Design a protein around this ligand. Sequence first.
Ligand SMILES: [Mg+2]
Ligand SMILES: [Zn+2]
Lengths: 139, 120, 81, 55, 143, 145, 72, 101, 189
Amino acid sequence: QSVQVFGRKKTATAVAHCKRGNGLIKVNGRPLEMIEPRTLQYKLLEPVLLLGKERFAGVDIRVRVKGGGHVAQIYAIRQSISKALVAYYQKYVDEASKKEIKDILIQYDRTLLVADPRRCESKKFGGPGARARYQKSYR
Amino acid sequence: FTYRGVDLDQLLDMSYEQLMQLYSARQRRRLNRGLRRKQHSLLKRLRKAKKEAPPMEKPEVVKTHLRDMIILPEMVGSMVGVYNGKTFNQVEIKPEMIGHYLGEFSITYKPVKHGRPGIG
Amino acid sequence: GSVELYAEKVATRGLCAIAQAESLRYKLLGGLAVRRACYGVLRFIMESGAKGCEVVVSGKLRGQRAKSMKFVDGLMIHSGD
Amino acid sequence: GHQQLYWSHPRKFGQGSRSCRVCSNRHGLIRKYGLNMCRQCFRQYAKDIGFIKLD
Amino acid sequence: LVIPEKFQHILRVLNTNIDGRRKIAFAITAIKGVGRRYAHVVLRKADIDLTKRAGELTEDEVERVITIMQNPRQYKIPDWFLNRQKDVKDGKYSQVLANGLDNKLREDLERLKKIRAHRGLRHFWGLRVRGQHTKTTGRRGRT
Amino acid sequence: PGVTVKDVNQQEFVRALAAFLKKSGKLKVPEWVDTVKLAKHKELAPYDENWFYTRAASTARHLYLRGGAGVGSMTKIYGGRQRNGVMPSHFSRGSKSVARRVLQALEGLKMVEKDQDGGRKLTPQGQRDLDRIAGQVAAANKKHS
Amino acid sequence: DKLNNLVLFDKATYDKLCKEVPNYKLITPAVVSERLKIRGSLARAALQELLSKGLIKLVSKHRAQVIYTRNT
Amino acid sequence: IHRIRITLTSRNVKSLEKVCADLIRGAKEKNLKVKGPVRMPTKTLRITTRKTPCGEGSKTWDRFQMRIHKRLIDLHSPSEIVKQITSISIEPGVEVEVTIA
Amino acid sequence: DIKLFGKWSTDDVQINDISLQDYIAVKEKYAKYLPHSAGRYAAKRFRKAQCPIVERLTNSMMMHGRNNGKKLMTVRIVKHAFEIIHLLTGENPLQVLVNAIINSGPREDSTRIGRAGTVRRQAVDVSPLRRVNQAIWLLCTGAREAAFRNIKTIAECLADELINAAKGSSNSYAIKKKDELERVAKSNR
RNA sequence: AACGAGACUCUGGCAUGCUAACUAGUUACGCGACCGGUCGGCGUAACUUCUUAGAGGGACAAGUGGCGUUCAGCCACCCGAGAUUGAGCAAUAACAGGUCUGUGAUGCCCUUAGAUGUCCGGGGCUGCACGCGCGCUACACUGACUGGCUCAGCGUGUCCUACGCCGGCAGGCGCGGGUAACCCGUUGAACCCCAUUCGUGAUGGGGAUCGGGGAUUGCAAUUAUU
Ligand SMILES: [Mg+2]
Ligand SMILES: [Zn+2]
């Protein structure tokens, strides 16, 4: 009845705990609709509306996210809940319904079950930034 | 002359703390911290110069390298040599400058008089 | 009483860079000529079975110009960890 | 007389208060770890100090 | 919304011409001796609302704001809100307005010119007095 | 299901508690409230005359969600961005006095209790009060809709 | 050319705000302030009154950008 | 006797890990109950200096590192077996520190 | 179902040209909820051919310095711009993006030939991706220049410039620069 | 065949497999609170998904399909954490490059007791009609202000600083922890996000230049140290 996952985007880490329950899904002490950009509301429910509400009716997810930036953290909760409903369907449900969940979530966004390896490079001397440099003058 | 609604008589006769209180916070910072040996010495020598002075004539020139030394009201009327670093220069203490540093009266430098530029 | 000095001979002294460069300095300090002594240390450490070596003496050799002499023998590696 | 004024000053701070522990120079000192050497002598000895260049 | 019939298009306070179709605090700011900050103090003291444009105010509100600004220390306008905290001669706390500000400037120039000090020499030759580096900059306005 | 503080939009909560503190009638308001900035990083004194009751609201909920937050942390909470002249912008803290005496007034109104871990946590009574404002506001917002 | 706008309303302009704006399809405070030569705060608060009157539909509101539509 | 603590600090991991294995194995054979390796966050000393002596360069920056590693191992046992297993097993390159209770 | 900004419908829109049918997105699949997907479309060549068109208009609206790093300013502004557009014309606001892209894009363009300092241009013809890109550029730049100080919201001013870019009027800064390009193309040939 | 390129070392991405952790947390159970949950609130067993860091796996153009003397290799697609991680080190040779001023590293020249020595007290490198250069900040509506809501990482520390109390603000006082994944520190950094006020004019955009005051550092601040 219990399954645990983690989302990753850049330095932002999410942790999703799935128990059998009424379908309550909360993030670090508040529902999906209290999150900071409200503009970014719809990216959070994307797997939800994709997966259907029926499959979330029997799943209670408590989500703990710290690290990174504001925007990154919503990608983190996205990741957490998606990876959660795929990794829970493996253990406590069959592989057919996990294949249904996965075929629905994959063709929309590949970032649902995978993370972007990419993270900030190192600024080096001789410039203000990773590549970018200081001006030079002849004459 | 008036400083904070207070004249030269009261200033001289006032205790050192009541002298301190009317100066700005900057003078208060260096005073409340105390004044040092090499300064109390110059204070004492300008006392002996002002005390030995003739009836109508101003006290003997006391030369000094202390620019950083604040002007007490007790130096009023006293001739202070201030070191500019080349030459001892001639300062005559008036009542208005009792808040200022001895130094600024001695200029640091010869004022720039420009002339035509040259090849570079 | 908390310090104890123990001297131990370096086993192959040709294959020590510090040792034979030291003897190179010392031998040039002998008033010995540049070419003969350097070819000696080179031929010695080479013979010691070390895959390769190079010797470079730079400074005043002949006169007031600035000379750098370089004798190279066998394999040599430079770049890389 | 002269014994009072030879070292007359509170040099407990400043640039001239500090010297490299090899070459006796006060220019460009590394004060971080209690290194107390100017940059050049630090760069000369880094091996034995155990500063390896990994980057 | 409103449609005020009595509105002063041109106002006069303390020798200065005030524009009242502007907002209130930022109209009062126009005069010397007042910024937005001290304006908010005086207008929060006089009980005058900040929502009104400066032309809707009755003569009683303009006269009580004037009365507040002439006499700073009576109205509980904090001693650190005063332009000149302790003046050199009388030793008093006074809030300096347009003509008085300009005059105090002129005078504090004259004192330093008669005294023969460095601040004043600086202010005399047309140099920046704060010890700025005058090599590179401090050009514009010169021949 | 009794709408504890965290299920509500927090700005509506801070709008609520700001008014509840004025309707209550018991608070200690500084003689200098109208006078000063809220920080060195700010230019213009706050427009709303309620700034002390809404800042005591914010202070109250930040100590609601975190105990152990004291004067240094109350000063650390308000981020300013200070733009200095021709020089770049840097970060600035809040006002010790006002944050600390918001907490001292809250200690005088018996909301805040002093913890053994050195900080300050809400009383049972203060927590009752906070979930009460939470209740009345969440209820008003979900019923009016 | 320099721009004069009305700080507080006039009867003339008020007839325009009152009798006209509800027919306008898309309504924006900058649109109203452009055609009626009203100032910013006055036009903004004008639409704040046309809210309380119930003559205008409010679609969305974000900070300084507001969207208003004509009633039916 | 309980809660004896051994703190190891060393310059390179190679020499270090082998000593930690000597101590955990050597103490585990005497059946002293052992809390095994706990590996603290690697502490690095980074120094950025100007390559050239006179600064006629392209403004090139030498980056020197040194890495220090700190590990802890916890034993439950008498003082004697620990002081003996420590004094008998010693390795070059590593510095050892003992705290107790 | 997939609804843009929660109230729109992507699958009902239409493309009238074959060249821009293979490139312009948000018809079949690519339609999303929100513009910001933070994906890598500059990864490989023509991988940015497939990213959502609304995101494409979105990315180009940060294009001046202070607005640079802030992306959300745009998904704000693109939000109110669409909701404005639907009120004026009364059509799917994603039809208005299609028509403005189609009409604003150049057709023929001039390539500079000569020695530096002497501009003598010869007429060549635009590639489809280049058409899309230049078009959107023109849209965002027309919006900026038009909205600098008129005290217009960029929501208001972009809905303006977009609807006008769709109708074919000379109001749009876009249609203007296009018309100049094609005319120079005529001059040379 | 050999050096240089690559390989290599250092850093980032992968591991729900392994080795484990009271100096990091998790799950579970208790007590605590306010209306079954919410809580960095307090304690015990449970373990490593998180958090560290070791071992070793993993990517080799590999798999499929196209362009190729079907040869190198080049393109597209899939399978996948990754089909381009960013730096260090750098040959045979040279420059009449920069370095007496980093060297108790020096060959000459000069200085050597009214010293080109050194210490002491002041001044000066900072000066101002002018050119040339990096760099900061802005010219506002994607903006300024005012309140409100939630985010980082690398490092620094015997100095960082917890919480009180007095202080409008800078600041005082104090009582505490940490040679540090223990204490500052759940490091509540800035945009951004949500409301508010402003309304195209030298405007609240921009803030130089100044006139007064408070506080710090220091022997010492005038030539504004901040
Ligand atoms: Mg290499
Ligand atoms: Zn040295």
